[PDB]
């Protein structure tokens, strides 16, 4: 259960002049990396989607949709704006048992095609982190996948902690 | 005495099709700046500034320019009133600007979430000035976009020494 | 304007001398003694590279001038590294103590950039040519302008010769 440490926040860029309206809608998880994310060849990770809706109060309603055990699973969360535009905290955190901390930081995006987002959580006093490569479609270029691999490794993650979920049709369209 | 490159006819200045006023709001950095009274100065190069567009209830923009000057943040506040067609504006309360008889704004192109080019024309002391700004949501833009902006500026009659790329800074505009 | 240090002039990696041969049109031309003559802008010329048995190039420049086709013939001898050349029989050029050629980049079948440096009367001249297999190029003109400026040259030292039909076809 030992973990690769979370990198210091100084190694995680923040998207300059983040546009919260432009970031909204559905994003597909085309890449996923983290200290508790592990490549499994026997049962490879299926792609899921995360949907961001801006509320009147500028927090996001965030719905994660996955296909799991023959069903569509839905996680509905609230992202509250954080210290800087492009950062978020999880709303009503006390209703998640074990969870003492949950940070979101958008690293880069061009809004209409791709994004990279960094997440850090403390759960049972264990510090987990992950990075998602988002696409507005289910596919992205080599170039972007490679940049995402390089960025994940710059945060201390080896190859086996970096996965490219297999596109599917169920639940996420 | 003043000698000015003439303003181009408006037919040489495109208009962004189906302009989305809500999407054009927020902060834009001035990454490129060209005009008949804009001059490159190597001794004291132009610092980057930002312009912030807020849509009002009545669809005019509140427009705030933020510059770093003499060690402080300077703030210019104006109003852009919608014009003949979407993407064009006039300056509100023009009589409070002494000498100013005319001021036109036309958004040439934008993709809203990264870049824009805006054309401005004003008549001040009966002198016809114009400029073009290359806007970015970030402080940097691609070669491709800078070159496009250079080409467009030249298509309106401006030589190289009337086209500048303000140097990125952190003070005031972050 | 001073010649830039050679460290600011790339060399084409793994230069293919056979593939570089044939006719190249001079679509761009820049240098510290090249000046836009705006009143009567310069005509395009061509430069033809023929590989000899001994791997030197026979290099023929063809211009249209005074109603005639003019021909300048020189020899480029391979230098320290593939893609670099020296001028052959340099001692027959009076005043010329040095002449270097360095191919900066090329894709062989469309475009190239070549850097030239010479010392003549103890004055250090340099120029850069943008070569095309055709008389027109794209993006590539802008790249050539930015490269020329990276070596210290302003806009007025960068020219785009006008395409013509006489002599160079
Ligand atoms: Th989770
Ligand atoms: Th003004
Ligand atoms: Th010569």
Curated annotation (Swiss-Prot), chain C:
At which positions is enterobactin bound? 99, 127
Q: What is the effect of changing residue 127 to A?
A: Strongly reduced affinity for catecholate-type ferric siderophores
Q: Where does a carboxymycobactin bind?
A: 45-47, 118, 127, 131
Which lineage ranks, top first, belong to the organism behind this chain?
A: Eukaryota, Metazoa, Chordata, Craniata, Vertebrata
Query: Which terms in the GO cellular component ontology are assigned?
Result: extracellular exosome; extracellular region; extracellular space; specific granule lumen
Please provide, alphabetically and separated by semicolons, the GO molecular function terms listed in this UniProt record: enterobactin binding; identical protein binding; iron ion binding; iron ion sequestering activity; protease binding
**What protein am I looking at?**
Neutrophil gelatinase-associated lipocalin
One of its GO biological process terms is: long-term memory
Q: Write the gene name.
A: LCN2
